[PDB]
Amino acid sequence: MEMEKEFEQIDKSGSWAAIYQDIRHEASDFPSRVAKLPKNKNRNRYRDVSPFDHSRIKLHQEDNDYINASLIKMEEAQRSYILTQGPLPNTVGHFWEMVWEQKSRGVVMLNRVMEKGSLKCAQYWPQKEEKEMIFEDTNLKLTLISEDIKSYYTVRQLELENLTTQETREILHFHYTTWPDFGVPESPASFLNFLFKVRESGSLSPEHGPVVVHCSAGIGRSGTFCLADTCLLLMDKRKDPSSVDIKKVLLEMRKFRMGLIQTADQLRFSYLAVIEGAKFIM
C-alpha cells in the first residue's frame, strides 16, 4: 500500500502495536559473540543491546578492538551510517578513535546528557574554548571552536587532533536538544528541519566517512533518524515514490543492528516524518 493512506488505515483501526510486533517477529537474528565476551562488559551500556559480529565497527588496536557500534550500509540509497550507544566514562576515548579512523565529518546526538534524573551518556566534548580535552588512552585532543545554540538544536564546530601524527580535522556536532523525556514529538517539523541541516553540511555525503549517530542505546531515536533519511532519499531516486515501503526499509536496516525503532510510537512518528517530509521536498 502507499504510505499516507496505510497510515490513516492503521490510525483508524488502532493497530500500531500489532504492526510493530510483526516487525519484531520478522527481524534478523545474527550472532553478537564479541560483544558478550567478559572483557567487554564495561564497554556496553545495556546488556540487551549489542552489535552483530558481521557489521560491528572494529577499532584499529591489537589489544581490544571492540566498541558498541554498527555499520548500516544501504545499497540502493547509497548511504551509510554508523549507529552507536552514548559513550560511557570508560569508552569516550574509543568513541573519538572511531570517529578518527572512519574519517567521519559529523556526529549526530539525539539525547541530553541527563534525562529523567539519570545520566544517559558521558559529557564527551568540551564546553569551553579554553578548556580542551585530552584522551590519553587513544592519544587524541579535542577543542571546542564555536557553538551556535538554536531553539531546537545546537551546532558545534570541534577540532580533533591525532597527537601521534599532529594531523587535525574539523568535526561538526549536531545536537538535537528537545526530544521529550517520555514519548515522541507531537509534530515532526523540528526533527525534519534538523535532518536537513545535517544534510546541508556535507556530513552525509560520499566524500566523507559515515556519519556517527547516537542516543542512549543507539537504536531508538537513532533508528528514527536514519530510517527517515533513507526513505526520503529513495522517494527522490525512484520513478514511483509511492513504491517506497517503510516497513521493508526498516527490516533491511535491522539486518545490520538489532532493535532499531524501540516502540510503536516511534514507528508511527517515523511514518509521520516521512509523509510530511515528502511534501516539503517538492
Question: Is residue 280 a contact residue for ligand GQP (CB under 6 A)?
Answer: yes
Cα separations in angstroms, 86 against 53, 75, 140, 200: 19, 26, 19, 24
Task: Find the radius of gyration of the CA atoms of the chain.
Answer: 19
Question: Is residue 229 a contact residue for ligand GQP (CB under 6 A)?
Answer: yes
Q: Which is nearer to ligand GQP, 59 or 227 (CB)?
A: 227
Distance of CA 145 to the CA centre of its chain: 23
Annotated catalytic residue within 121, 215, 226, 231: 215
Q: Which three cell numbers stand for residue 31?
A: 550472532
221 annotated binding-site participant: yes
Cα separations in angstroms, 229 against 194, 197, 209: 11, 12, 17
231 has catalytic annotation: no
Question: Is residue 249 a contact residue for ligand GQP (CB under 6 A)?
Answer: no
Question: Is residue 261 a contact residue for ligand GQP (CB under 6 A)?
Answer: no
Q: Which of 114, 75, 121, 89 lies closest to 213 in space, CA to CA?
A: 121
Q: Which is nearer to ligand GQP, 64 or 242 (CB)?
A: 242
Q: Which is nearer to ligand GQP, 133 or 232 (CB)?
A: 232
CB under 8 Å to 121, separation ≥6 — which residues?
A: 85, 86, 87, 88, 111, 113, 214, 216
Q: In the sheet that 133-135 helps form, which strands lie side by side, from edge to edge?
A: 56-58, 66-74, 79-84, 211-214, 106-109, 167-176, 153-162, 140-149, 133-135
CB 73 within 8 A of CB 201: no
Question: Is residue 187 a contact residue for ligand GQP (CB under 6 A)?
Answer: no
CB atoms within 10 A of CB 32: 19
Q: Which amino acid is at 189?
A: A
Q: Least separation, in Å, of the C-beta of 260 and ligand GQP? A: 18
Question: Is residue 232 a contact residue for ligand GQP (CB under 6 A)?
Answer: yes
Of 155, 171, 192, 244, which one interacts with ligand GQP (CB under 6 A)? 192
Question: Is residue 277 a contact residue for ligand GQP (CB under 6 A)?
Answer: yes
Question: Is residue 196 a contact residue for ligand GQP (CB under 6 A)?
Answer: yes
Q: Per-residue contact track with ligand GQP, 130 to 169, x per CB under 6 A?
A: ----------------------------------------
CB atoms within 10 A of CB 235: 19
Q: Which stretch binds ligand GQP (CB under 6 A): 20-28, 131-139, 154-162, 185-193?
A: 185-193
What residues act catalytically?
A: 215
Binding site for ligand GQP (CB under 6 A): 189, 192-193, 195-196, 199, 229, 232, 276-277, 280-281
Annotated binding-site residues for substrate read 181, 215-221, 262
